[PDB]
Amino acid sequence: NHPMLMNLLK
Amino acid sequence: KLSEEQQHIIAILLDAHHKTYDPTYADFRDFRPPVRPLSMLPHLADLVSYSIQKVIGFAKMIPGFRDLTSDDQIVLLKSSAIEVIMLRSNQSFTMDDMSWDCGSQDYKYDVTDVSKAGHTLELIEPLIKFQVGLKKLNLHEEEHVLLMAICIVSPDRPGVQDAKLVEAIQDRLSNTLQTYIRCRHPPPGSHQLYAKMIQKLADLRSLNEEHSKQYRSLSFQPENSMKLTPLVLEVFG
Ligand SMILES: C=C1[C@H](O)CC(=C/C=C2\CCC[C@]3(C)[C@@H]([C@H](C)CCC(O)(CC)CC)CC[C@@H]23)C[C@H]1O
């Protein structure tokens, strides 16, 4: 799980 | 001859880098301040965290990158972030005194500063050698941006699923690069320049591995990992 990286990648 | 497609690729990557690398370093005033035995850890953690955000913003713009699953995007960025941070940092690095010079004395980083972030010469010495050998290539900004994009889209990162797709994206970048050098980089600077640049990608794998070892060792102590950022913890582990 990588919520913050996922969010930055749109 | 660079095709229309290849010129497009370069324009896109130049722009993407311009929109993600402020050569005035103005945002550095937002970081926890430098103090000069892990006294540079808060500042440098903030710098790396910001740099991870900028690297992601560049990656999203690499032609073909968005066509990857959201999962493959993640694996590629997690494994390359430290390497693209080391590559893009070559723009502030100066051989004058072997330091990263980001606009001012407070924001000028030397070997002592990195060691005050918790790292040893096992990392720092090959890192400076890399930066020196990279600066000595005197790359065109076009080459610099293609190398970062080729670094991110590497089909052999572990955990990659659709390797054939990552390979196809990377090849189109590699070909652009090989063609750029041939068409636009005059001899003697061009002599084996592609082979040399690919050698810098291998040097980065070795830098990534030693960075990982020291980072695990640094971050295992909960008192150091407390000084990192949520994004650094998420991306580096
Ligand atoms: C905007 C940028 C400027 O060119 C300045 C940059 C410099 C990058 C550097 C020079 C100082 C030491 C740094 C942060 C290296 C060290 C080993 C990271 C340290 C660390 O492991 C990061 C979690 C612990 C603080 C990686 C890249 C190096 C990043 C680059 O993104």
B27, HSE (Cβ side, Cα atoms, 13 Å) = 12
In short, whether B92's Cβ falls inside 6 Å of ligand 1 is: yes
How many domains does chain B divide into?
A: 1
| Closest to B146 (Cα-Cα) out of B108, B117, B175, B168 | B175
Q: How was this structure determined?
A: X-ray
Q: Are the C-beta atoms of B42 and B28 separated by less than 8 Å?
A: no
For residue B91, which atom of ligand 1 is closest to its CA?
A: 4
Give the CA distances from residue B117 to residues B24, B85, B89, B183, in Å, rounded to whole numbers and listed in that order.
23, 16, 16, 43
Domain extent at residue B111: 1-237
Asked whether the beta carbons of residue B56 and residue A8 sit closer than 8 angstroms, the reply is yes
| Closest to B84 (Cα-Cα) out of B180, B181, B17, B6 | B17
Give CA–CA dist B162/B159, Å, rounded: 9
Whether B168 has its CB under 8 Å from any CB of chain A: the answer is no
Give CA–CA dist B45/B234, Å, rounded: 13
CA of B35 to the centre of ligand 1 (A): 15
Tell me which chain A residue has its CA closest to the CA of residue B81.
Answer: A5
Q: What is the CATH number of the domain that holds B48?
A: 1.10.565.10
Return the structure tokens found at B100: 């990263």
- Residue of minimum CA distance from atom 26 in ligand 1: B86
Give CA–CA dist B128/B118, Å, rounded: 16
Largest separation between any pair of C-alpha atoms in chain B: 56
Contact residues on chain A for B53, CB-CB shorter than 8 A: 8
Q: Tell how strand B99-101 and strand B93-94 pair up.
A: antiparallel
Give CA–CA dist B206/B204, Å, rounded: 5
Give CA–CA dist B193/B75, Å, rounded: 29
CA-derived radius of gyration, chain B: 18
Helix (H) or strand (E) holding B100: strand B99-101
What is residue B92's DSSP assignment?
T
Asked whether the beta carbons of residue B74 and residue A5 sit closer than 8 angstroms, the reply is yes
B234 closest CB neighbour out of A2, A9, A10: A2
Give CA–CA dist B150/B166, Å, rounded: 10
Q: DSSP letters along B2-69, please?
A: --HHHHHHHHHHHHHHHHH--TT-GGGGGSPPP----TTHHHHHHHHHHHHHHHHHHHHHSTTGGGS-
Whether A10 has its CB under 8 Å from any CB of chain B: the answer is yes
Helix, strand, coil share (%) of chain A residues, nearest 5:
60, 0, 40
Chain A interface mutation, best of B65, B80, B232, B235, highest count of A Cβ atoms under 10 Å? B235
Q: What φ, ψ does residue B100 adopt, rounded to 5°? A: -90, 115
